[PDB]
Coordinates of C-alpha atoms and ligand atoms in Angstrom, one line a residue:
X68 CA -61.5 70.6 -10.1
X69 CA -63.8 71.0 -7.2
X70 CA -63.2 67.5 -6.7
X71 CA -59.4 68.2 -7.6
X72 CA -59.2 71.4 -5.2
X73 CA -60.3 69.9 -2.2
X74 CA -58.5 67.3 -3.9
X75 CA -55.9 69.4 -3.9
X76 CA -56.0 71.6 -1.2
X77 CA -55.8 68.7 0.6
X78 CA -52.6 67.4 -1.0
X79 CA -49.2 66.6 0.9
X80 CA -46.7 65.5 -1.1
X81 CA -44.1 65.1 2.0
X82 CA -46.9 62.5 3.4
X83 CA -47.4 60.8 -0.1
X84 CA -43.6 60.6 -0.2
X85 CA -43.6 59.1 3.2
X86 CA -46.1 56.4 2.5
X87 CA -44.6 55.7 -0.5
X88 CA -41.2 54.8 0.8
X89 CA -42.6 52.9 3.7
X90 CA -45.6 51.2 1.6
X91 CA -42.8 51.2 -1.3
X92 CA -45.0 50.3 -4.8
X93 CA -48.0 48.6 -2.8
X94 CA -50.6 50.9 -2.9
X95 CA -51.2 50.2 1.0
X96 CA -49.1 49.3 3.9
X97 CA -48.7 45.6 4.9
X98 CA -48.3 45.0 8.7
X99 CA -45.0 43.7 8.2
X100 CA -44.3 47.2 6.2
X101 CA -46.4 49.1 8.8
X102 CA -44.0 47.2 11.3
X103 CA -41.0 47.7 9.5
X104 CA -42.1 51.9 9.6
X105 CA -42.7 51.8 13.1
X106 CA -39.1 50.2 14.0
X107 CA -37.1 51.9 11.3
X108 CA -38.8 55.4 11.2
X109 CA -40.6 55.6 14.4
X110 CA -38.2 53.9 16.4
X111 CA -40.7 52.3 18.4
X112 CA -39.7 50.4 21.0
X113 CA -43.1 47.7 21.5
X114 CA -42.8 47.9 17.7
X115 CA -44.4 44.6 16.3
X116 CA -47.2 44.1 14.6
X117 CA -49.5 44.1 18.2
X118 CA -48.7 48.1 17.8
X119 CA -49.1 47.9 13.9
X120 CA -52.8 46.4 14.4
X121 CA -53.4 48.4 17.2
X122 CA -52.8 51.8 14.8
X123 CA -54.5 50.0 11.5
X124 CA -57.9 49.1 13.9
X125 CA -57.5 52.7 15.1
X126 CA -57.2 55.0 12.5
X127 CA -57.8 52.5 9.3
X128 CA -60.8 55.0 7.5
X129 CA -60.9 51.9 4.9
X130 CA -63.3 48.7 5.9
X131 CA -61.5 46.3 3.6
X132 CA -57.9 47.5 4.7
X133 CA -58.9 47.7 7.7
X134 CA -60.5 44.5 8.2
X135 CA -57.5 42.8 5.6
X136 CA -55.1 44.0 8.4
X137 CA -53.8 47.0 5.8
X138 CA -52.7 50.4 5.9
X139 CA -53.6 53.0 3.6
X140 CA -52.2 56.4 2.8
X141 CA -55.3 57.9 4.6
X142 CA -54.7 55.8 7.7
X143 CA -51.3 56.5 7.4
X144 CA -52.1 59.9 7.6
X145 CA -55.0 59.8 10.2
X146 CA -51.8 58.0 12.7
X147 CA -49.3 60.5 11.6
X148 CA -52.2 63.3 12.9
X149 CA -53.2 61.1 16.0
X150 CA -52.3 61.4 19.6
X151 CA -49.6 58.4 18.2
X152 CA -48.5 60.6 15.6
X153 CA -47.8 63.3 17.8
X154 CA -44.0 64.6 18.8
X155 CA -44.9 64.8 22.2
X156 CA -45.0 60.6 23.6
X157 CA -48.2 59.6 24.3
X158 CA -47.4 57.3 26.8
X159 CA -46.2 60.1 28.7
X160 CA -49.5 61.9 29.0
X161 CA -50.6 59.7 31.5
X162 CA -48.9 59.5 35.1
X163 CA -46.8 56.7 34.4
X164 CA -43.3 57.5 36.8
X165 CA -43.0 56.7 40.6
X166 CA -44.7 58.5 43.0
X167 CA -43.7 57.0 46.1
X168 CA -40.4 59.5 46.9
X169 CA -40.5 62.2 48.9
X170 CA -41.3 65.7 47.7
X171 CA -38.0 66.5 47.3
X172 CA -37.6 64.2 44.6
X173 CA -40.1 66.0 42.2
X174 CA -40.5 69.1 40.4
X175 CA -43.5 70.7 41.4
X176 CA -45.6 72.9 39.8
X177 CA -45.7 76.1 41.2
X178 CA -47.1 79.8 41.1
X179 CA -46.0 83.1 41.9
X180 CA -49.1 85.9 43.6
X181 CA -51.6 83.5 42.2
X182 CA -54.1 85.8 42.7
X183 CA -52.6 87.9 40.2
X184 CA -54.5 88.1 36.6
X185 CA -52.1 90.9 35.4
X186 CA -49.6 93.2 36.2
X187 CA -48.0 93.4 40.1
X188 CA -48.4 97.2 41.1
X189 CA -52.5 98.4 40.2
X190 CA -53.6 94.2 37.7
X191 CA -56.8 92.8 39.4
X192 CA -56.6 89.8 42.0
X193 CA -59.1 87.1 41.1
X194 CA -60.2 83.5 42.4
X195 CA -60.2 83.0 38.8
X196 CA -56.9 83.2 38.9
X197 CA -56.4 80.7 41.3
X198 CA -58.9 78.3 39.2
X199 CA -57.0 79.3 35.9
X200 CA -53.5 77.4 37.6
X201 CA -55.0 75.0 38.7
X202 CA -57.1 73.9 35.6
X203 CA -53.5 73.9 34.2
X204 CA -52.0 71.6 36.5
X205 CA -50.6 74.0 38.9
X206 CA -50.1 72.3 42.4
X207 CA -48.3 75.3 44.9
X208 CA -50.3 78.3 45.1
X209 CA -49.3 81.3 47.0
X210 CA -51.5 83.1 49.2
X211 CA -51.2 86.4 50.3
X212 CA -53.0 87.5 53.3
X213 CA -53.8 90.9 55.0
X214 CA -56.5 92.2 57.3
X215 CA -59.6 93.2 55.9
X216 CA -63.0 94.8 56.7
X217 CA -65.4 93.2 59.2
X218 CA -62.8 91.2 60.6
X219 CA -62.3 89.4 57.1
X220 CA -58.9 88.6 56.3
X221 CA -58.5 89.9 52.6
X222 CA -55.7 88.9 49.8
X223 CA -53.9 91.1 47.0
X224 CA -50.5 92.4 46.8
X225 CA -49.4 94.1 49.9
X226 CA -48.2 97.6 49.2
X227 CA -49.3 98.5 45.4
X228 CA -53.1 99.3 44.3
X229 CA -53.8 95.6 43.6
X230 CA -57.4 94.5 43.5
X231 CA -58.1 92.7 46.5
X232 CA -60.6 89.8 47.0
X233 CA -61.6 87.5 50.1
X234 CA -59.3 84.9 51.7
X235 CA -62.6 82.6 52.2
X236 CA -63.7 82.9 48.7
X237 CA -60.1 82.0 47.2
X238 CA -60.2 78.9 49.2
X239 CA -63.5 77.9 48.2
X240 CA -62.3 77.9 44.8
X241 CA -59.2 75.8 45.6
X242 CA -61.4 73.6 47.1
X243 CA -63.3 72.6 44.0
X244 CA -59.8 73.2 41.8
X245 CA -57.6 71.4 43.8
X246 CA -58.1 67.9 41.9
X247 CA -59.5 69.0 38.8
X248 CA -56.3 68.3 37.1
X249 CA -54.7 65.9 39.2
X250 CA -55.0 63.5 42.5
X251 CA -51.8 65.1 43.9
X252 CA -51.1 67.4 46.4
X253 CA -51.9 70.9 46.8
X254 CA -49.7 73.4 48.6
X255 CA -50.8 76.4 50.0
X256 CA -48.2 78.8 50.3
X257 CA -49.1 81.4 53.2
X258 CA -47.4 85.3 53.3
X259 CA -49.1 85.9 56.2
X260 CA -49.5 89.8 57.9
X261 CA -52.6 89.4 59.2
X262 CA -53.1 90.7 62.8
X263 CA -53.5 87.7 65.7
X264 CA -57.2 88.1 65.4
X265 CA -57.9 87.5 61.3
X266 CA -55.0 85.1 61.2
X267 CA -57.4 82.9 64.0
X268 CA -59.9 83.8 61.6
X269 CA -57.9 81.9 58.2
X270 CA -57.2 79.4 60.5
X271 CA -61.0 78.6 60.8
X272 CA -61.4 79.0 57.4
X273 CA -59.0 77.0 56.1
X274 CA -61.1 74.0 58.5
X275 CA -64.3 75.3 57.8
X276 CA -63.9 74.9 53.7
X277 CA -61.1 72.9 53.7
X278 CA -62.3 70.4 56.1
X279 CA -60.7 66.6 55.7
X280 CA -58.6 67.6 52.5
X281 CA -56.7 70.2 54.7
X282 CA -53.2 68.2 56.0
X283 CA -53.2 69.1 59.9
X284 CA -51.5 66.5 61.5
X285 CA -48.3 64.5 60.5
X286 CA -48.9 61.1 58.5
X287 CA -47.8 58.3 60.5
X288 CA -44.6 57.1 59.9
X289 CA -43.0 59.4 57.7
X290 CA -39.8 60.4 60.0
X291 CA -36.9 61.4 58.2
X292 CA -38.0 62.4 54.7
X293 CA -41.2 63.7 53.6
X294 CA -44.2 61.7 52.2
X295 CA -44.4 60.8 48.4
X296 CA -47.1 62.6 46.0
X297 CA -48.9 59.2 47.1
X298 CA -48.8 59.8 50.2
X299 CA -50.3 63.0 50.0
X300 CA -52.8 62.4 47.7
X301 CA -55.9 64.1 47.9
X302 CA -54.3 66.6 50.3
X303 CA -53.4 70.2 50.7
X304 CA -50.5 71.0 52.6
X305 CA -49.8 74.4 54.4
X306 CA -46.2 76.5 54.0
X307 CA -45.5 79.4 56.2
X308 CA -43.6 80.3 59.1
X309 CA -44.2 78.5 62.5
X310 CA -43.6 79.0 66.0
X355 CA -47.0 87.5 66.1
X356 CA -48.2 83.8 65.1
X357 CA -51.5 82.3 66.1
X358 CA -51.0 78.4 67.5
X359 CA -54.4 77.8 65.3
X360 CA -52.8 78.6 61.7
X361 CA -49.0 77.6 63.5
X362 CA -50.1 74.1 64.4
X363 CA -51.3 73.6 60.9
X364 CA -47.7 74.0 58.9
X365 CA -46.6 70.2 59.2
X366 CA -44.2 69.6 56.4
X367 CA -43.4 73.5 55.1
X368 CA -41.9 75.3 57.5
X369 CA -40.5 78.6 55.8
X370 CA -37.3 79.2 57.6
X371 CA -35.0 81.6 56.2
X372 CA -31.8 80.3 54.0
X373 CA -29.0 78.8 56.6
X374 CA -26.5 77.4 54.4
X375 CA -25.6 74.0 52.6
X376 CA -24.7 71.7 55.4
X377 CA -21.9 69.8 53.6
X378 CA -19.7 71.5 56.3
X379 CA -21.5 69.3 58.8
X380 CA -24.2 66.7 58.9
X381 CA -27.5 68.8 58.7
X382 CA -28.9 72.7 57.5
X383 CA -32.4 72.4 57.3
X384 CA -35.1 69.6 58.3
X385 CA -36.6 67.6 55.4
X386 CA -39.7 69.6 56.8
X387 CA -38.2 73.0 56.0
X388 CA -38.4 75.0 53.0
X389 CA -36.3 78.1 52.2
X390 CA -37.5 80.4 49.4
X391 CA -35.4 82.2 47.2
X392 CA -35.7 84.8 44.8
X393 CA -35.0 84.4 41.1
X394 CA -31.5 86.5 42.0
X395 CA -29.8 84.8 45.0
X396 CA -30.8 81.8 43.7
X397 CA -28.4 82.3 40.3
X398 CA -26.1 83.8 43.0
X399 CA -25.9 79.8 45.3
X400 CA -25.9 78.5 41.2
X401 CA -22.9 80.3 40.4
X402 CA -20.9 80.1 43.3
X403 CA -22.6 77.0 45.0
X404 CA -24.4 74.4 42.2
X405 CA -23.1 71.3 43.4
X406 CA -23.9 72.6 47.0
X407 CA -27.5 73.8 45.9
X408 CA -27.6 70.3 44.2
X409 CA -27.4 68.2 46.8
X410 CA -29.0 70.4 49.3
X411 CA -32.1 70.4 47.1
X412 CA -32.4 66.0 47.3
X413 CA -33.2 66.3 50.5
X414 CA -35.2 69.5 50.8
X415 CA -37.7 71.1 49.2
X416 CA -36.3 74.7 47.3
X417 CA -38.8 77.5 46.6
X418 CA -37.7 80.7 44.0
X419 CA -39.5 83.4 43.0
X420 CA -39.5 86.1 40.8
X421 CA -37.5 89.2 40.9
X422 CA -39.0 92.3 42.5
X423 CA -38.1 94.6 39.5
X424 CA -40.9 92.0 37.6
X425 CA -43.9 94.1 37.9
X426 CA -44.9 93.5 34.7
X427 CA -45.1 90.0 35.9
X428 CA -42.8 88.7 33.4
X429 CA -41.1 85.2 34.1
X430 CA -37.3 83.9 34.4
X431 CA -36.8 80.2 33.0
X432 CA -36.6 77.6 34.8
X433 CA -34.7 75.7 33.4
X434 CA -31.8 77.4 35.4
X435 CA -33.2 76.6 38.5
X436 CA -34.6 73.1 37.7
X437 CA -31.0 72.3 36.4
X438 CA -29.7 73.6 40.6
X439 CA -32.7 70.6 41.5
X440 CA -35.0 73.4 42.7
X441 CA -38.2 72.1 43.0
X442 CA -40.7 74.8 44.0
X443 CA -40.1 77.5 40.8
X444 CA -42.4 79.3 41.0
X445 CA -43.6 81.4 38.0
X446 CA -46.3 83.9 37.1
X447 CA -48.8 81.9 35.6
X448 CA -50.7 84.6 34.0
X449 CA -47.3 84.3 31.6
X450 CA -47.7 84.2 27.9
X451 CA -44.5 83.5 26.8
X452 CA -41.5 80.7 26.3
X453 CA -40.8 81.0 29.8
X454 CA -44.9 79.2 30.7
X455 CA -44.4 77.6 28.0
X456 CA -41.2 75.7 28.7
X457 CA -42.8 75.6 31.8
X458 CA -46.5 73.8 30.9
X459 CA -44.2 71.3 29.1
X460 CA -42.3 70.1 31.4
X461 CA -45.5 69.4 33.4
X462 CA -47.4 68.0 30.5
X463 CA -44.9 65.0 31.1
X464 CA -46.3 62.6 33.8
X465 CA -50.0 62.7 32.7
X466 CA -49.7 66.5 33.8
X467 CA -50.2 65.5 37.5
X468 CA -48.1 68.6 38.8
X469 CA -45.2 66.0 40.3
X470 CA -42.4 65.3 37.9
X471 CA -39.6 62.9 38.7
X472 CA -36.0 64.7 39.1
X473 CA -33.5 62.8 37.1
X474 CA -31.6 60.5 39.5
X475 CA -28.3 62.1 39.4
X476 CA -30.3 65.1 41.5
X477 CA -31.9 62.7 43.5
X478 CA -28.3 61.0 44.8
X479 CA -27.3 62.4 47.5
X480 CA -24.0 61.9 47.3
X481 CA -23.4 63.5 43.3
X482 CA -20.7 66.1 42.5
X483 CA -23.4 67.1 39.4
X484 CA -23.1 70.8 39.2
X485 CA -24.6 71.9 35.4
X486 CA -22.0 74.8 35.4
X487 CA -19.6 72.9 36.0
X488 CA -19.7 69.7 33.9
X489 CA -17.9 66.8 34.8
X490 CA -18.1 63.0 33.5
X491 CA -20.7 61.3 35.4
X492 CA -24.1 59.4 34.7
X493 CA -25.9 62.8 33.8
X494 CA -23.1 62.8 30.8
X495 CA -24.7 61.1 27.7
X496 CA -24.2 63.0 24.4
X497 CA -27.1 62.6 21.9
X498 CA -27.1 64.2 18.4
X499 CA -30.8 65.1 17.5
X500 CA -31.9 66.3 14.1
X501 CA -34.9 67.6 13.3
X502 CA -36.4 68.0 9.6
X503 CA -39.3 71.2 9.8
X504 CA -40.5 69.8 6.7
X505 CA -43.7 71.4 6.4
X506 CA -46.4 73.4 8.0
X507 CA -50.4 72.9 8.4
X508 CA -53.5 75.3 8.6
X509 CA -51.1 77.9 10.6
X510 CA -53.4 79.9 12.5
X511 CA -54.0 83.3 11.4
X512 CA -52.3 85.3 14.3
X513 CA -54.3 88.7 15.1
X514 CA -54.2 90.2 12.3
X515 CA -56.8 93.1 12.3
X516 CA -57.4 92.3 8.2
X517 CA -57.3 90.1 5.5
X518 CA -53.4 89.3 4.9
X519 CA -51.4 86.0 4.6
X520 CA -48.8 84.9 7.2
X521 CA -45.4 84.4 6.6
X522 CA -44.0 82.0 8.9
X523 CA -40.8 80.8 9.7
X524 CA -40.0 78.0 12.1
X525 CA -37.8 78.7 15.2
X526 CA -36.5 75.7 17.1
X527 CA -34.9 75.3 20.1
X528 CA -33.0 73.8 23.1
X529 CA -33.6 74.6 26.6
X530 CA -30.8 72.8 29.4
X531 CA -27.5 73.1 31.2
X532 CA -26.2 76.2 29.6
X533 CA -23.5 74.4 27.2
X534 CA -26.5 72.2 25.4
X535 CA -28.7 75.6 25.2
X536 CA -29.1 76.4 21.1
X537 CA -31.7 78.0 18.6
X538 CA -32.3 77.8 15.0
X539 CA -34.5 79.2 12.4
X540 CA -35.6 77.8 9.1
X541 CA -36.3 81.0 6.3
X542 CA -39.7 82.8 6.1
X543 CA -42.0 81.6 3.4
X544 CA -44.1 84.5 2.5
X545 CA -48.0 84.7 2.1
X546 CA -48.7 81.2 3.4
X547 CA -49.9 79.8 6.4
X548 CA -52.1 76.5 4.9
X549 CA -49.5 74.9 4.4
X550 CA -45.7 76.6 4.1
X551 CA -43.6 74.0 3.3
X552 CA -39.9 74.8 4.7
X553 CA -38.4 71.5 4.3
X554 CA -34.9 72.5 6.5
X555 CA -33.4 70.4 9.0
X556 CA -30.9 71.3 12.3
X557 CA -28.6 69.3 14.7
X558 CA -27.9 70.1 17.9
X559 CA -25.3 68.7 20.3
X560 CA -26.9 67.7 23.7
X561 CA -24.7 66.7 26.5
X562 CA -27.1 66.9 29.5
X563 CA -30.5 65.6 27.3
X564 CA -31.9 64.3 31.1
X565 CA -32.4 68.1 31.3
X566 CA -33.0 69.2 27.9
X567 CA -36.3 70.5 26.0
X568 CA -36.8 70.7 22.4
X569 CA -38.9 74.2 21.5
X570 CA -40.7 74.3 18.7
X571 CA -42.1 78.4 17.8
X572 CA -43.7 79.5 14.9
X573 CA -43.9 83.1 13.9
X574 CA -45.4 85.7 11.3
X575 CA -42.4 87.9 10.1
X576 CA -42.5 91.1 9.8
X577 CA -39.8 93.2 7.7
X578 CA -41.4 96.2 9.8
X579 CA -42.1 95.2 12.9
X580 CA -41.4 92.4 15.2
X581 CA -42.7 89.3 14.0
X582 CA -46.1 87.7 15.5
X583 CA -46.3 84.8 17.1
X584 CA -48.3 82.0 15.7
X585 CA -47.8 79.2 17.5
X586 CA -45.4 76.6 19.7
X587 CA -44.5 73.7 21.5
X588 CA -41.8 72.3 24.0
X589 CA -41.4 68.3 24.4
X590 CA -39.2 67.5 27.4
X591 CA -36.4 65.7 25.6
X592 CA -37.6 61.9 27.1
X593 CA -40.9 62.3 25.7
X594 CA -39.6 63.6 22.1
X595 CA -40.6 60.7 19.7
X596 CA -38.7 60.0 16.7
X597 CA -39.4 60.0 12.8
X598 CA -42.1 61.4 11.1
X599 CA -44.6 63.5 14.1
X600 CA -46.5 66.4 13.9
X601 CA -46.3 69.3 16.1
X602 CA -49.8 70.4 18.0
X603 CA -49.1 74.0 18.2
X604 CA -50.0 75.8 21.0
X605 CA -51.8 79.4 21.3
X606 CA -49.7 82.2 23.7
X607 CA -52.1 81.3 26.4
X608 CA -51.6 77.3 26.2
X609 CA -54.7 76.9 24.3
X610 CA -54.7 73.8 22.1
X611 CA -54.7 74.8 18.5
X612 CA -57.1 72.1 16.3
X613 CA -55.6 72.0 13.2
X614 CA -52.7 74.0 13.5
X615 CA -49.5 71.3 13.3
X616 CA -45.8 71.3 11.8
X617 CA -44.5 68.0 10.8
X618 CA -41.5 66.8 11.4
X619 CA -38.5 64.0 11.3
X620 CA -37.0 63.3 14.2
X621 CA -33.9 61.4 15.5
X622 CA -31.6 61.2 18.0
X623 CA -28.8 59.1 17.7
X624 CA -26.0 58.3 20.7
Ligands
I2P1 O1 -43.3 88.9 45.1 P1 -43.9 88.8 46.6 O2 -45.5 89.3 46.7 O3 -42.9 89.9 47.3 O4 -43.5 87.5 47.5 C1 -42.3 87.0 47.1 C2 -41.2 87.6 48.1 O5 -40.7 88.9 47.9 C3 -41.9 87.7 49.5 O6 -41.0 88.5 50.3 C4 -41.8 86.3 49.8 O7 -42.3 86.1 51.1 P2 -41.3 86.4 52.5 O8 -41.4 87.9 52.7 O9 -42.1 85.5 53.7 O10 -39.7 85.9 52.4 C5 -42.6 85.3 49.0 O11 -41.8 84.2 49.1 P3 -42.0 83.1 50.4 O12 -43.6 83.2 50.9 O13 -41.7 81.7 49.8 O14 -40.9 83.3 51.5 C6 -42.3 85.5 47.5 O15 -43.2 84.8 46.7
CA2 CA1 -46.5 87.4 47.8
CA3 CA1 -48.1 88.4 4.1
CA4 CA1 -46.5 89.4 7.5

């Protein structure tokens, strides 16, 4: 009663119904059946029974099971709840993809006015800010410097009532940041308008505090691409215009040079040096997309592409970027301050890789020679259809989301793809009123994907509202590669990224060529 509702509040039919069919009328799982689950259900690749004892010595509650080499429903559960249990591949939490090609090759994670907490007209400018990206992988940072008091160059955002704080004290706080969240490279972007005098000034700064992690001076070798994340790691690279401009802050931009957009060279032989870097706002850029993909495309293997947003985004609001990751742009840089699916596609993409900030472009985008143009899809090695279905079969512990009293969510389950345009698709199970403990939607969706070396699966939960516009609860967005199949729960996400204890969805997945 008390023993039956905890009993019972703790009672999940969909998991009892799972065990069963895998442990069939045992009353525990056998490694061969545990084996059998992880092949059949789980699709596991090492699947064998070296993975089936791994789980049972790892998440086995029971001594004689556990010691008998068994599996019970408990165990099967504490697995299906582990970080082996979970959607998003374990194995890709860790850096685990090659990090010996040049910049180019990898989406970086950037930011856009990272000293900006809020708003781009009258928010505060923080170092927290600068310490908030970075603690969340962030690896390009963008600097903006003016002339302040006492000769101390100052940063906020030129030309609006911005809150301003000191160009020393932000690079303190990159200093200790930097490498928090990974070994890789740090770049610094630089809108410099400081007068001669305060840009000598940074440039003694950026010495003084940045010392021996500061990049001044070419690696050897390294002559017609740029270094790998390897290369670099443990370093901070400079971007900014060089030769109004000091030699001191000049002779530090090495491999960022920010030139101004030529063209694609394909009409000749070269455009822009490995070692230069043209930005481009969140407009033009879909402008070269439309008009120019494949051109973009290949211009992007080489070199290194930044994009920002557009100017009408005071409000700090973010484009996706999947748009401009699907052009090979590298350097999309977003405001990080962001709640909303546009961060969060963008966190998830980075939590690939062991969240080190560099992930690998897929290698049609890394040939130099491919006629890939995502707007334009043709047969070629980026072309591998995939059907993928997904069961939302139930929900658990949904958080309450801020609600100033005592009512019960009513969640619904959104799901969706994010990719080349033509895979791009969204579904929604039904609402299932006054329950959030553990809403039970049981629904499953296909979707079609063409382009799935591009693709991201989105998983949003949200409080309806027949009123209003629903709240949201909760999400999460596994990069297509690192979606793992069969029975998985969700981790669910809070708007700012925040990890969400109990707060899962569990789901079947598949994908099928
Ligand atoms: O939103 P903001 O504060 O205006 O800055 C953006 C842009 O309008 C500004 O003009 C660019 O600098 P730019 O004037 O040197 O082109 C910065 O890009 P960039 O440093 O990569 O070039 C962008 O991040
Ligand atoms: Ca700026
Ligand atoms: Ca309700
Ligand atoms: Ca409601």
């Amino acid at each position: 009663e008390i023993e039956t509702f905890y009993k019972m509040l703790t009672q999940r039919a969909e998991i009892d119904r799972a065990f069963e069919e895998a442990a069939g009328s045992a009353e525990t799982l056998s490694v061969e059946r545990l084996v059998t689950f992880l092949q059949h259900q789980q699709r596991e690749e090492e699947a064998g029974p070296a993975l089936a004892l791994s789980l049972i010595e790892r998440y086995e509650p029971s001594e004689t099971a556990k010691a008998q080499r068994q599996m019970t429903k408990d165990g099967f559960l504490m697995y299906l709840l582990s970080a082996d249990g979970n959607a998003f591949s374990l194995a890709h939490r860790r850096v685990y993809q090659d990090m010996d090609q040049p910049l180019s090759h990898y989406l970086v994670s950037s930011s856009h006015n990272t000293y900006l907490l809020e708003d781009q007209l009258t928010g505060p400018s923080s170092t927290e800010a600068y310490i908030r990206a970075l603690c969340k992988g962030c690896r390009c940072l963008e600097l903006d410097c003016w002339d302040g008091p006492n000769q101390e160059p100052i940063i906020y955002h030129g030309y609006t009532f911005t809150s301003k704080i000191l160009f020393c004290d932000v690079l303190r706080a990159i200093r200790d940041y930097a490498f928090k969240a990974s070994p890789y490279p740090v770049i610094l972007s630089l809108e410099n308008h400081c007068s001669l005098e305060q840009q000598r000034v940074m440039a003694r700064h950026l010495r003084a505090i940045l010392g021996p992690i500061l990049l001044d001076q070419p690696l050897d070798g390294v002559t017609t691409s740029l270094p790998s994340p390897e290369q670099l790691k443990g370093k901070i690279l400079l971007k900014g215009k060089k030769l109004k401009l000091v030699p001191e802050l000049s002779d530090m931009i090495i491999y960022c040079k920010s030139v101004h957009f030529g063209g694609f060279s394909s009409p000749g032989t070269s455009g822009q040096a490995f070692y230069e870097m043209a930005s481009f706002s969140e407009s033009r850029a879909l402008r070269l997309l439309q008009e120019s993909g494949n051109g973009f495309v290949r211009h992007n293997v080489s070199c290194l592409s930044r994009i920002y947003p557009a100017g009408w985004r005071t409000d700090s609001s973010n484009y996706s970027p999947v748009e401009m990751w699907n052009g090979g742009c590298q350097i999309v840089a977003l405001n990080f301050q962001t709640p909303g699916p546009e961060m969060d596609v963008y966190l998830g993409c980075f939590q690939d890789n062991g969240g080190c900030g560099y992930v690998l472009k897929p290698a049609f985008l890394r040939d130099p020679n491919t006629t890939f143009n995502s707007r334009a899809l043709t047969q070629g090695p980026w072309w591998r259809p995939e059907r993928l279905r997904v069961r939302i079969i139930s929900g658990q512990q949904l958080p309450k989301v801020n609600k100033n009293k005592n009512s019960i969510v009513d969640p619904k389950v959104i799901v969706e793809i994010h990719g080349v345009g033509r895979d791009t698709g969204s579904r929604q199970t039904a609402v299932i009123t006054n329950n959030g403990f553990n809403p039970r939607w049981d629904m499953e969706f296909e979707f079609e994907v063409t382009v799935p070396d591009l693709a991201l699966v989105r998983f949003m939960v949200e409080d309806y509202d027949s009123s209003s516009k629903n709240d949201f609860i909760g999400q999460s967005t596994i990069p297509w590669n690192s979606l793992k199949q069969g029975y998985r729960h969700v981790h669910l996400l809070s708007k700012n990224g925040d990890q969400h204890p109990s707060a899962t969805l569990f789901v079947k997945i598949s994908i099928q060529d």
